Amino acid sequence: REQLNLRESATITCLVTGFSPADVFVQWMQRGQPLSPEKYVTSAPMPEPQAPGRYFAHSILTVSEEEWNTGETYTCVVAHEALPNRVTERTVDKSTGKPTLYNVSLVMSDTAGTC
Amino acid sequence: REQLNLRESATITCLVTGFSPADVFVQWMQRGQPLSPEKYVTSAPMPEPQAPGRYFAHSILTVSEEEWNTGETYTCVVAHEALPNRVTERTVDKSTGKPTLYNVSLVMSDTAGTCY
Amino acid sequence: LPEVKVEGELGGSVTIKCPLPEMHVRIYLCREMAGSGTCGTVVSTTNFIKAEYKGRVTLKQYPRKNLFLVEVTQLTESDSGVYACGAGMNTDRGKTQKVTL
Amino acid sequence: KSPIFGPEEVNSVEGNSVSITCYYPPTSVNRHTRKYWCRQGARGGCITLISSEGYVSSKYAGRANLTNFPENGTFVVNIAQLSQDDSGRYKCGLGINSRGLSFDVSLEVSQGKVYTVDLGRTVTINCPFKTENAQKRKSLYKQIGLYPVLVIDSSGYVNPNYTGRIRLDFSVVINQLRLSDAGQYLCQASNKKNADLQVLKPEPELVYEDLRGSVTFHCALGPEVANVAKFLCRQSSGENCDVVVNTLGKRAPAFEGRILLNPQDKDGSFSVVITGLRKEDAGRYLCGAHSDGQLQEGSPIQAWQLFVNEESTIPRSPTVVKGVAGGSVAVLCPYNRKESKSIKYWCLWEGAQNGRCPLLVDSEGWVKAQYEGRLSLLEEPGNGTFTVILNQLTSRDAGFYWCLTNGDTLWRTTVEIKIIEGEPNLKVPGNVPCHFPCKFSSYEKYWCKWNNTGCQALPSQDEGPSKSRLVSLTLGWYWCGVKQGHFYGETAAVY
Amino acid sequence: ERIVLVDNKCKCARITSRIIRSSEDPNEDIVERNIRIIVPLNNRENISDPTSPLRTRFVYHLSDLCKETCYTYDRNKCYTAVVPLVYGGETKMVETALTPDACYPD
Ligand SMILES: *[C@@H]1O[C@H](CO)[C@@H](O[C@@H]2O[C@H](CO)[C@@H](O)[C@H](O)[C@H]2NC(C)=O)[C@H](O)[C@H]1NC(C)=O
Numbered sequence: 001r002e003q004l005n006l007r008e009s010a011t012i013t014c015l016v017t018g019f020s021p022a023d024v025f026v027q028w029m030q031r032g033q034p035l036s037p038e039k040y041v042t043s044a045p046m047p048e049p050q051a052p053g054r055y056f057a058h059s060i061l062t063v064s065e066e067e068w069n070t071g072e073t074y075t076c077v078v079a080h081e082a083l084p085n086r087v088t089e090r091t092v093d094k095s096t097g098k099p100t101l102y103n104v105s106l107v108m109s110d111t112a113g114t115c
Numbered sequence: 116r117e118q119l120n121l122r123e124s125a126t127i128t129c130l131v132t133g134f135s136p137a138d139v140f141v142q143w144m145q146r147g148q149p150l151s152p153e154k155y156v157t158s159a160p161m162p163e164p165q166a167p168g169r170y171f172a173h174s175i176l177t178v179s180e181e182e183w184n185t186g187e188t189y190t191c192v193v194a195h196e197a198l199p200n201r202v203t204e205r206t207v208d209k210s211t212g213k214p215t216l217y218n219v220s221l222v223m224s225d226t227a228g229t230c231y
Numbered sequence: 232l233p234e235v236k237v238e239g240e241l242g243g244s245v246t247i248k249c250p251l252p253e254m255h256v257r258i259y260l261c262r263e264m265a266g267s268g269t270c271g272t273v274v275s276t277t278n279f280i281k282a283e284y285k286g287r288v289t290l291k292q293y294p295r296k297n298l299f300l301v302e303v304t305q306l307t308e309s310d311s312g313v314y315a316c317g318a319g320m321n322t323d324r325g326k327t328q329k330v331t332l
Numbered sequence: 333k334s335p336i337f338g339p340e341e342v343n344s345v346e347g348n349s350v351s352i353t354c355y356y357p358p359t360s361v362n363r364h365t366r367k368y369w370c371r372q373g374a375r376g377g378c379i380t381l382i383s384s385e386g387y388v389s390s391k392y393a394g395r396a397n398l399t400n401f402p403e404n405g406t407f408v409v410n411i412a413q414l415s416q417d418d419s420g421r422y423k424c425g426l427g428i429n430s431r432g433l434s435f436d437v438s439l440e441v442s443q444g445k446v447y448t449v450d451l452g453r454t455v456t457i458n459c460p461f462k463t464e465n466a467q468k469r470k471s472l473y474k475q476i477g478l479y480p481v482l483v484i485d486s487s488g489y490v491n492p493n494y495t496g497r498i499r500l501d502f503s504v505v506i507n508q509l510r511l512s513d514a515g516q517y518l519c520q521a522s523n524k525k526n527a528d529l530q531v532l533k534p535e536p537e538l539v540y541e542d543l544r545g546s547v548t549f550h551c552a553l554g555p556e557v558a559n560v561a562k563f564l565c566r567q568s569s570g571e572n573c574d575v576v577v578n579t580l581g582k583r584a585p586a587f588e589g590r591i592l593l594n595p596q597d598k599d600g601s602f603s604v605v606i607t608g609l610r611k612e613d614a615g616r617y618l619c620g621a622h623s624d625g626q627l628q629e630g631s632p633i634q635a636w637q638l639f640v641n642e643e644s645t646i647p648r649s650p651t652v653v654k655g656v657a658g659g660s661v662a663v664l665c666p667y668n669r670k671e672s673k674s675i676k677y678w679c680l681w682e683g684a685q686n687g688r689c690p691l692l693v694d695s696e697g698w699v700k701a702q703y704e705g706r707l708s709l710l711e712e713p714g715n716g717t718f719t720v721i722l723n724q725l726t727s728r729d730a731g732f733y734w735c736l737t738n739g740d741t742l743w744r745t746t747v748e749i750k751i752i753e754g755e756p757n758l759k760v761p762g763n764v765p766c767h768f769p770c771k772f773s774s775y776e777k778y779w780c781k782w783n784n785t786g787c788q789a790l791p792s793q794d795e796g797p798s799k800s801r802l803v804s805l806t807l808g809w810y811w812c813g814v815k816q817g818h819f820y821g822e823t824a825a826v827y
Numbered sequence: 828e829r830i831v832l833v834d835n836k837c838k839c840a841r842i843t844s845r846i847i848r849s850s851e852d853p854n855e856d857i858v859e860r861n862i863r864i865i866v867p868l869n870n871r872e873n874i875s876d877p878t879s880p881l882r883t884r885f886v887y888h889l890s891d892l893c894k895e896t897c898y899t900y901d902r903n904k905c906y907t908a909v910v911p912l913v914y915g916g917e918t919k920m921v922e923t924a925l926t927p928d929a930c931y932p933d
């Protein structure tokens with residue numbers, strides 16, 4: 001929130017924790033198709049503090065605050081030789097990532113209904 | 116509810132059981148005045164299978180299905196030479212069931228969890 | 232869920248087309264009930280026809296390309312509701328062929 | 333509820349490692365989700381103490397391990413350096429902690445001449461003797477109220493409590509001990525020396541089985557008691573062994589046909605087989621020979637804690653396939669698709685207790701006396717099941733039939749054949765009549781030349797409904813039956 | 828004693844019914860209905876489309892469940908999407924696993 005107040009640029013981080021072997025490959029995809037590698041800069045696997053044989057990487061993507069404020073979905077895709085289909089992805093954007101308000105609308109109907 | 120969902124019609128049933136002389140006579144009154152015998156059909160008395168001198172009879176009165184949702188009444192009057200003062204009236208409404216109370220309970224917590 | 236927009240005069244008649252899944256268990260036309268917000272059947276696969284719409288509508292079945300047609304003989308300018316066709320026992324949520332007049 | 337099953341209650345002494353195995357339904361999700369061992373904190377949900385994904389807590393650091401056996405379908409958590417603090421309520425499960433899918437384990441750690449034996453078992457106690465006097469006046473002594481209140485008469489007469497099971501010499505031998513018999517007896521010979529006696533109820537051997545499946549109990553009791561009649565309880569809340577099956581002959585009403593009991597081996601180890609397990613089969617099954625049959629104290633017993641998974645991979649099998657006398661049936665018996673058949677044994681039931689099944693047919697083709705001819709097994713529907721048929725509707729055939737296989741997962745699926753006399757759907761006996769109703773004729777009425785090895789179709793009247801079917805062999809046992817194609821309809825017996 | 832009327836994992840909607848016997852007589856046993864609903868609150872509108880907008884309005888019609896857009900991932904069902912993974916020049920469409928626990932090949 002402090003970085004978002006400055007209205008300069010926001011940094012979104014993708015943390016990959018727990019893996020083993022030491023190779024992992026993270027890609028970033030702004031709302032749809034791939035971001036070009038100048039933008040983000042993932043680090044290198046470095047042994048996790050307190051879990052003997054697992055590791056962790058970290059990839060940081062820097063975007064314009066408007067771009068983050070409009071509401072774009074940014075996705076982190078990890079390729080590892082240990083995942084199900086070697087790849088997985090987690091997306092986050094403006095309102096999913098630590099939103100200030102939850103706005104729901106349960107509308108249950110036919111509460112009776114011959115079941 | 117099954118047939119109500121059909122949204123086509125509603126069937127109400129007077130069911131009269133235990134009358135021994137078996138000359139009983141049902142009749143439907145809706146909106147304080149008797150309904151024409153075209154709507155309601157009354158079966159002939161038949162012996163009570165579970166006893167002896169007691170009989171039974173139906174009378175099913177059919178009605179517009181949304182009338183039943185309208186919120187009417189449809190009384191039924193079994194008149195038969197054995198009831199205390201010769202007539203017995205019964206009434207059914209959409210809310211004739213004993214009151215149902217809800218208990219909605221909205222857990223907006225992020226800890227306290229569910230149970231498989 | 233499409234809603235045919237038909238207009239006709241006091242004597243003008245309107246025909247309604249709805250799909251026929253060949254199930255034949257129940258295929259029906261339903262006027263929108265504005266007094267409560269749900270849906271009330273007017274014609275179905277068993278003779279029930281509304282008292283206000285007494286003998287003014289009829290249904291036709293065609294297997295050539297599965298037509299269910301509602302033909303209205305008369306029209307008393309009474310604002311026709313959302314004649315939403317549907318299938319199955321459940322009238323309210325069986326809706327498909329949405330028609331408004 | 334949760335299909336996870338584990339020890340409802342572990343216990344141990346401090347400083348001793350414990351092993352807690354939790355069973356989960358083997359599926360890809362269950363095999364690859366997170367396995368967690370958490371502690372239900374007094375107010376607050378689980379604090380995850382160890383996980384399959386390499387996590388271990390502040391504690392359980394170097395003390396614990398959590399191994400996942402997907403093939404067995406289990407995961408075992410080992411806790412070493414147990415202490416009085418490590419006692420309470422834990423949960424073992426899958427996925428997220430605040431989520432349900434789990435089992436509750438109540439762990440209790442107890443503070444750390446002794447003779448410990450099971451209830452109803454041989455034990456003997458030693459009492460040092462002074463040799464200066466040849467034989468001082470001694471008897472047996474008991475620890476009840478600070479002074480051995482008469483437990484064995486010095487003349488040798490047995491106490492009413494310890495009646496007919498004690499012998500004295502300094503060695504005293506007693507067998508068939510009940511739970512209350514054991515105690516830290518102080519015996520003298522007056523040279524007083526201490527002793528200890530402990531009785532422990534045998535821990536149940538957890539068995540996790542599936543719904544609509546089969547289970548086997550191996551009552552390997554000691555040979556000694558071997559010859560005494562044996563039984564199989566089902567322990568209720570209050571101590572009352574709803575006896576299910578008995579060697580003597582007692583049978584439980586709601587377990588007919590199904591249960592089969594193997595004869596006792598050389599020693600005293602017989603197996604009890606239960607089939608078509610349902611949700612009401614979950615409970616403690618207690619063995620125990622003690623002639624009467626009712627689980628009464630002072631008897632060697634063996635315990636099992638069956639848990640029936642309600643999320644089973646075994647598909648539905650029609651429990652009854654009743655048919656017209658003189659007609660035929662069709663019994664589709666499911667088997668494990670993974671492992672194909674070896675011998676498709678097909679059986680009967682002698683009783684609800686003995687119930688020795690009589691392999692009517694086998695993959696080789698050997699058939700029994702009365703079903704010689706009138707019975708067959710025909711593999712297809714190949715995809716992991718088959719179809720055993722039985723034409724010529726005799727009444728006596730009413731009962732329960734088991735679809736045995738000698739593969740691995742031995743579900744012994746059971747099917748009830750309720751025969752009812754009525755109109756036969758196909759025509760009579762040849763020489764060649766045959767007839768099946770037009771409503772039943774939507775398929776393809778066929779003929780087969782019956783061979784105990786393999787049914788082979790041969791020409792007959794192959795037309796439309798003709799009086800309806802018929803058989804012609806213009807120029808043995810033969811079959812004239814309807815076929816669905818993939819599956820099969822009823823039969824017809826001609827000569 | 829609960830009779831599980833429905834258990835819809837597409838919407839986390841479980842309906843069970845029970846005849847609770849408060850008093851020790853007849854005609855005073857309350858027949859119940861235990862609707863339990865779990866709201867995702869962070870799931871997208873299109874469960875199989877990660878980039879779709881967040882879902883805010885949750886509609887549950889107890890007739891369509893007693894007898895299609897889902898709200899929650901089923902844990903037994905393998906949900907996957909397709910993502911472009913450009914590495915080198917070679918862009919390749921790859922099958923990403925939205926739910927990784929349930930998507931291991933057998
Ligand atoms: C989002 O929703 C639509 C339905 O509302 C579905 O899209 C199709 O489903 C397949 C399933 O693999 C997708 O792979 C296809 O790409 C979709 N068809 C199209 C348009 O390609 C699915 O739920 C989601 N599909 C999207 C939006 O990718």
Ligand SMILES: *[C@@H]1O[C@H](CO)[C@@H](O)[C@H](O)[C@H]1NC(C)=O
Pocket residue numbers: 103104105883884
């Ligand atoms: C919150 O939900 C309400 C009700 O559906 C809606 O009217 C409103 O626009 C929503 N607001 C936001 C910010 O999503």
